[PDB]
Design a binder for this molecule. Structure first.
Ligand SMILES: *P(=O)(O)OC[C@H]1O[C@@H](n2cnc3c(N)ncnc32)[C@H](O)[C@@H]1O
Ligand code: NA
Length: 642
DNA sequence: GCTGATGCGTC
DNA sequence: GTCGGAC
DNA sequence: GTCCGACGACGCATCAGC
């Protein structure tokens, strides 16, 4: 058809056949995908992005259904189902090396341009590949590009990085128009679309509803909404959207869903893809809540429970009929090999009447000598894969807080009151191994405030708050953040704030391109009279405040660092700043740092101290660097976490 | 055979 | 993980 | 409220470099 360079999936009255830029049965050109990404990136309304992607997907369904799965993965910037663990092994480092080689430029020139533009894609797009012959290779296809990404991910072992670079250079030699922009962005993990998983699902359900799969070509039905009123069409697409979303939340695996969609259609989907032990599901998440009054505003008169928010890692534990056990992370990564200790303890936690289950738990590092919870930083020293039981050094205690499936029954549509009762009755607590989350069922503001204080004294982050009977199910498609998280550091004037010195700035990427995206901060070490880097900072300022920072710090730029500023192994700022600006910064906790020099030697011989979840609060106009938080004060704050 | 750099996961 | 922007 | 993408610390697994 038309040249893909003119493809317009944002067109009014888009016709899936007549407005496609490829012919029936042809492989979807990658430029059609790139042009769709361009039209998505250009707008800010999600509904417009969804419509534009839906248009592409409808053409793929009508003309080239085998390319639906790769086009979806390209749009998500995924390589496959998360539990399979495919990794490119390519970050900005390898990518920039490949761009420099492909274009015949020095690495430092490419690296500087990428930082100034805030986007590796703009560098790859606007320089020619010097491996080009006079006549270019054939145009890239969507399935071809996706398969090359998978080729990169499958390369392993010694000398594999050079082989990955060879594939990347091969892609850039074949790119036309905007293709190199989005190839580079995909490899760097920054597509910049404004459209991600929820909008992709909305576009997919819309596409297969409007243009049904499986029709004989040319399709008799290219727009199944045309005979409906706008109102009826909206209700219908909402209903179809929810069928897809709820299925995906139970089975978040397009390798499973898309073959079924193409063969049987969306209405029959839940009959083929259902929640089942052994298939990871999307977990229920939590909305930050900045005080107890906000909890009551949110839940109104509905009864709720408060639970300790344990400071570990989420572990979704699956016991299949027949005895097999699998464990998955919050993001569906397979963690079974990480927890041989947990797997051996399953017979100890479940009563013998339990034949299958999916449990929702927090894995927390546990000191068996002292019988107490250990920090997250201890938990993260566990080995990750193919771990044998005898070698475990850091023991774990599971804190169980939900039950999603039991003895063949999905509990996703059941109220927490019932799920929790089934949990409490069919599982067995053992101190230091498997325990139900500490909880309080109350509506008393004074009791809740005291329970929050106690959770912190008992080594937890705060509270989780969950309704028991009103909108109390585990239906992620209806509300993915159905629980509330209440932390003391959310409250204004409560928690540890530090006054820290701005000693450097980093050029922004993406939404921050053309200004500063982050800053390097320092505490004041009284004893050496030096400023010591403590953390970087990149959230907490409004867009207006960030522009004010850019204009107020420009006069402080230095060509070289001051000799009394120490950053050791911290990332060197793009712009050094004369120490002057002092900012109020809040954090959740202080951590022992392998890189930052702040307070090194005061708590640990080799490690200084950094901030967990730092965020900007406000400028301290009334403070100069000498009155910033001292490194000794930092050490005192760390110690009193106990 | 060992260490440092990079990637990508956890929070 | 926190946060603010756009809807 | 939802969705999204800016940005944070940090540590294991892997591979480049030696
Ligand atoms: P994020 O800060 O969004 O918080 C959600 C995670 O908190 C962990 N968690 C600890 N303890 C609980 C309880 N009692 N209930 C729910 N979630 C809890 C989980 O790992 C969440 O992913
Ligand atoms: Na994130």
């Amino acid at each position: 058809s038309n040249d893909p360079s003119g493809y317009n999936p944002a067109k009014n009255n888009y016709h899936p056949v007549e407005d496609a830029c490829w012919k029936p049965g042809q492989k979807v050109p990658y430029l059609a995908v790139a042009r769709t990404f361009e039209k998505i990136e250009e707008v800010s309304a999600r509904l417009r992005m969804v419509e534009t992607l839906s248009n592409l997907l409808r053409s793929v369904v009508a003309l080239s259904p085998p390319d639906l799965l790769p086009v979806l993965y390209l749009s998500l910037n995924h390589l496959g189902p998360p539990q399979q663990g495919l990794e490119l092994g390519v970050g900005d480092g390898v990518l920039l090396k490949a761009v420099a080689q492909a274009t015949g430029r020095q690495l430092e020139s490419v690296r500087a341009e990428a930082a100034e533009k805030g986007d590796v894609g703009l560098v790859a797009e606007n320089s020619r590949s010097t491996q080009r012959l006079m006549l270019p290779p054939p145009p890239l296809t969507a399935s071809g590009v996706f398969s090359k990404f998978r080729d990169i991910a499958r390369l392993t072992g010694s000398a594999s990085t050079a082989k990955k670079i060879d594939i990347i250079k091969g892609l850039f030699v074949a790119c036309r128009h905007s293709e190199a922009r989005f190839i580079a962005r995909s490899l760097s993990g920054r597509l910049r679309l404004g459209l991600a998983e929820q909008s992709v699902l909305a576009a997919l359900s819309q596409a297969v509803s409007l243009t049904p799969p499986g029709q004989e070509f040319p399709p008799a039905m290219v727009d199944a909404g045309k005979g409906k009123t706008a109102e009826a069409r909206k209700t219908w697409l909402e209903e179809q959207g929810m069928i897809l979303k709820q299925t995906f939340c139970e089975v978040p695996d397009l390798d499973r869903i898309i073959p079924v969609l193409l063969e049987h259609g969306l209405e029959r989907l839940p009959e083929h893809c259902k929640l089942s032990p052994g298939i990871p599901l999307k977990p229920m998440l939590a909305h930050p809540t900045r005080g107890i009054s906000e909890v009551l505003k949110r839940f109104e008169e509905a009864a709720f429970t408060c639970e300790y928010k344990y400071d570990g890692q989420r572990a979704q534990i699956h016991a299949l009929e027949g005895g097999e056990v699998k464990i998955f992370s919050r993001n569906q990564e397979d963690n079974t090999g990480k927890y041989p200790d947990i797997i051996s303890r399953i017979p100890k936690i479940k009563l013998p009447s339990v034949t299958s289950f999916i449990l929702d738990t927090e894995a927390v590092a546990w000191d068996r000598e002292k019988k107490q919870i250990q920090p997250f930083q201890v938990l993260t020293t566990r080995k990750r894969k193919e771990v044998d039981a005898s070698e475990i050094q850091v023991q774990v205690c599971l804190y169980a807080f939900d039950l999603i499936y039991l003895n063949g029954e999905s509990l996703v549509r059941e109220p927490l009151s019932r799920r929790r009762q089934l949990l409490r009755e069919n599982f067995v607590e053992t101190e230091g191994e498997f325990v139900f989350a500490t909880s309080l069922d109350t509506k008393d503001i004074e009791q809740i405030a005291e329970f929050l204080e106690q959770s912190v004294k008992d080594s937890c982050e705060g509270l989780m708050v969950k309704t028991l009977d009103v909108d109390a199910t585990y239906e992620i498609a209806k509300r993915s953040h159905n629980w509330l998280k209440l932390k003391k550091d959310y409250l204004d004037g409560v928690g540890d704030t530090l006054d820290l010195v701005v000693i450097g700035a980093y050029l922004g990427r993406g939404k921050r391109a053309g200004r500063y995206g982050g800053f390097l901060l320092a505490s004041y070490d009284e004893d050496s009279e030096e400023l010591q880097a403590i953390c970087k900072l990149g959230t907490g300022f409004s867009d207006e405040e960030l522009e004010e920072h850019h204009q107020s710090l420009k006069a402080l730029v230095l060509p070289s660092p001051r000799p009394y500023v120490r950053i050791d192994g911290a990332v060197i700022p793009d712009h050094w700043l004369d120490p002057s600006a002092v900012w109020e910064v809040k954090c959740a906790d202080l951590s022992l740092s392998p890189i930052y020099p702040a307070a090194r030697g005061l708590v640990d011989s080799d490690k200084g101290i950094s901030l967990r979840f730092p965020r900007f609060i406000r400028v301290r106009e009334d403070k100069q660097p000498e009155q910033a938080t001292t490194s000794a004060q930092v050490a005192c704050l760390y110690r009193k976490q106990s």
